[PDB]
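Re-running the complex after MR caught last week's input typo. The corrected sequence lines follow. Everything else is unchanged.
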Amino acid sequence: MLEAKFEEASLFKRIIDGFKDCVQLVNFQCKEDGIIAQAVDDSRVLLVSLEIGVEAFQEYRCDHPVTLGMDLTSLSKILRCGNNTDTLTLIADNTPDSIILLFEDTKKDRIAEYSLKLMDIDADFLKIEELQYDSTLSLPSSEFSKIVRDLSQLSDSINIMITKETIKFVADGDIGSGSVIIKPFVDMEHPETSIKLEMDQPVDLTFGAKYLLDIIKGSSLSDRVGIRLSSEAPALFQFDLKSGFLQFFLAPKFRAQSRIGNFFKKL
Amino acid sequence: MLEAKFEEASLFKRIIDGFKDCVQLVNFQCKEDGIIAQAVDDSRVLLVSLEIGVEAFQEYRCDHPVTLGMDLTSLSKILRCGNNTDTLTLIADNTPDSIILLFEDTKKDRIAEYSLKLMDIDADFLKIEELQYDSTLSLPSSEFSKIVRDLSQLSDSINIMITKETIKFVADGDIGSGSVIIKPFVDMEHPETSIKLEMDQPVDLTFGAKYLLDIIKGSSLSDRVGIRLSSEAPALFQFDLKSGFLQFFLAPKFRAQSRIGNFFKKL
Amino acid sequence: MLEAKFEEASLFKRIIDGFKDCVQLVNFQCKEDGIIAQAVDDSRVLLVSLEIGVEAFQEYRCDHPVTLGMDLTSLSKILRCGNNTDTLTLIADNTPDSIILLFEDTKKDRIAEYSLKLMDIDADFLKIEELQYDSTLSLPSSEFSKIVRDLSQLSDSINIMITKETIKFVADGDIGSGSVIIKPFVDMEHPETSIKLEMDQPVDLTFGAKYLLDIIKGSSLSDRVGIRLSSEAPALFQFDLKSGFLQFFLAPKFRAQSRIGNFFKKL
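Corrected-run output:
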């Protein structure tokens, strides 16, 4: 038996929005420490990884570990039934063939109970390699999605280059090219805006703009994206949650598109 | 000679919007005490019925009874030409071959005189029965249409069930289920937020969501919808005007779509 | 070498927006006194002509006169970048094969630099002899596009008739017809809402509503359009900038559309 209550239903909606469009059929495995999910797009270059701590809920309790296979686009149909600020409680049984979503309003005399039919999804789970990154940076999610959205008009590839307190996004395509250069700074007056490069080695990696355009959809979960780049492993884009996170692992282009399985092996 | 005058043109526009998406070709009957209209969907499940009392006009004069056959989508093209706040004056002659719409502003000697060609529409007036309904309820137009819009994600059929001070909407479909339970409560704080119910008899009917979604388009005429349900009659959805109304009669599904002609016969 | 700076990038976006939908491949000629552009639609009915004086730039310099052939729809992709209020600097070389667009934000130390590949466009330039117009008028750009957008609901032709302190737009079509008449006046409380007419002879011209709908897109540049109509010359619609303008020369219909090339000959 599972009983997870979100203080505001919009949170679980913003989370699910964060990686539908990249993958549609996801296994949500509910443990007693929270809910985790992992999924790889059909091109095998982008790996979504979800972690929600018990702490992120108003109340959470999972008797046994349970796997909830869900179609994200049908789940998001249900998740638009909220009143944005409603009490969303995910509830399920022992060997559930369906989960229940119970939207509660504070005004009471008003409760809505939706049932999502579950699905059997084969689970290819890939151990995420504990690895050190050459250059880890952090910037407001707001400005990153604007950098990505601008340059993707110009090319199918965006390149990230970290050199000595220089972060350089470049896109070169048929109609032309673009550069946006940002340098690390703290503005304590309003500190939710610092660019924090930390560079061991310089890194020059190129990614498909299409995957980055799906990654920036996680911006609705955190004020700042943390990006961690390594010369020869997938890049980590991370949006931080109340006490979990949404992580996109992006196989870079070396430029041949490499696949995420060339770094991460099955369980 | 007909000279109807809406001090605010927006009101004849919100009226037509309430059922342009339901029936296209409608006959507007203009007599001495006001205007009536009646139309049935091409599937003969929905019966729209319009009534505008004279009191709803700022000025109104109709010498002898006149019928205006109109293509609602062409009328709505013209009705989108105002400033919302213009005084729209509806005008016609004897044996009218076209109607006149006269938008007047109060912020300038501005007059946009439009002419809509009239149309010959076969009259299919059906009598109305409205026998003592087992149960009648009323709720905010806002709250009703969101209930309908939510559940229609889940199934093609919405079922309404009235019991002791409990109104239950339920939708059962391929991806899952949804039910909303509301309880009558009258609330002096603000009168617009009161759910009213009178159950002489408990009653449950199932309707096509596709039709309900056209019915909720009437939300733009009153802040509250009135619903009247009986076991062997069509359901009555009613949006009230200042001395008028727009009503939808909906043939229920009792697993089969029944057609309104099994309840209403010709004139 | 060319260095043209807009104080706000917003201006060059709304300028290009004003006629990207009318012609796609435009030659922008930078002389030292500013930038000029002229282009004709594929139907040879509408002639766009642009003029930006240096007075319109925050900063401006052009050593030798240079022509930049540009694809407007590719240019507007770049012009969608930046923060609308950045300092956009247009930059070019001797025989430039590319333009450089430099978005600066006057708040942080961030510079975004785009390069647009140029285009080889044959300079179909027309000598323009505007002559005397029988009638010239001016009204709010707001009100003109609302008149045009309204009346094109009804027909493919809109007729403008100037006669005795009366401006009369008429549209006659299949579903019906509409006429709006405006009279010349002045309200000093708000002096940008005034209709100004000056008539030597009355004029009655008919235009294609498709062309008018592209012309009204210039409203994003000025609060007022100036219209000048003569009997057998194209109509002039003009939106004024601080030091320059965007003007449309529109070959009238006489039931038959004339071609701009029947009034203006090659250079």
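None of the earlier attempt is carried over here. The domain at 2-117 of chain C is CATH 3.10.150.10 (DNA Polymerase III; Chain A, domain 2). Residues 14 and 123 of chain C are 24 Å apart (CA to CA).
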